[PDB]
Design a protein around this ligand. Structure first.
Ligand code: NA
Ligand SMILES: [Tb+3]
Length: 129
């Protein structure tokens, strides 16, 4: 599923990401926009053999099992395919565990490089919330 900006903002608000670990909703929408362009089926193969999956491009090295990342973990205890569903529940729950790590939203490279320090509230501007 390919979300619209305000449609995802509402879906993410409904699943508790607004101010989760102190990160306002706009941070989450901005991160999803640049990680996946709001596409739940987005995947990106990394040079270490791992793959990033879903709306927030969650990586198989630590967070999910895809059966093809040599030396990996599955801390969200899910198959990586669960991060590609039209229902964003699994992606939100695993994102909650990632952001609870010592590095917070810095875990998402696109968030750190394109969202952090910006006027992120602009990402929820004009949205039904
Ligand atoms: Na894994
Ligand atoms: Tb850590």
């Amino acid at each position: 599923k390919v979300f619209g900006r305000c449609e995802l903002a509402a879906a993410m608000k409904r699943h508790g990401l607004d101010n989760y670990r102190g990160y306002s909703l706009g941070n989450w929408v901005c991160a999803a926009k640049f990680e996946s362009n709001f596409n739940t089926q987005a995947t990106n193969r990394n040079t270490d053999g791992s793959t990033d999956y879903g709306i927030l491009q969650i990586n198989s090295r630590w967070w999910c099992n895809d059966g093809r990342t040599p030396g990996s973990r599955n801390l969200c205890n899910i198959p990586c395919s669960a991060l590609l569903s039209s229902d964003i529940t699994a992606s939100v729950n695993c994102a909650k565990k990632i952001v609870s790590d010592g590095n917070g939203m810095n875990a998402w490279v696109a968030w750190r490089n394109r969202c952090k320090g910006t006027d992120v509230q602009a990402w929820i501007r004009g949205c039904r919330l």
